[PDB]
């Protein structure tokens, strides 16, 4: 049990690092997604804005 525990605890803590690494990567991907969404938004809106202003001519 000490060995199985060391493995369960080691695997748990390691896997917990995989949890925090995947989680961190998810947050970073979300910050990137957000930034991407923000740029998308900003561009579509900048164009739609400018286009509305410039529909005419």
């Amino acid at each position: 049990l000490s060995d199985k525990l060391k493995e369960a605890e080691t695997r748990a803590e390691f896997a917990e690092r995989s949890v925090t690494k995947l989680e961190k990567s998810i947050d970073d991907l979300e910050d990137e997604l957000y930034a991407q969404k923000l740029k998308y938004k900003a561009i579509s809106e900048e164009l739609d804005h400018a286009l509305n202003d410039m529909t005419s001519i």
């Binding site: 286009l51 410039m54 529909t55 005419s56 001519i57």
Partner: peptide, 29 residues
């Protein structure tokens, strides 16, 4: 953009039309 292309032409037309009016009117006046 259709709005820009057309309305730019409309402003060009205000010039072209105003100019034709200016020229004809001035030719007589």
């Amino acid at each position: 953009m259709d709005a820009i292309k057309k309305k730019m032409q409309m402003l060009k037309l205000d010039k072209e039309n105003a100019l034709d009016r200016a020229e004809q009117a001035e030719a007589d006046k």
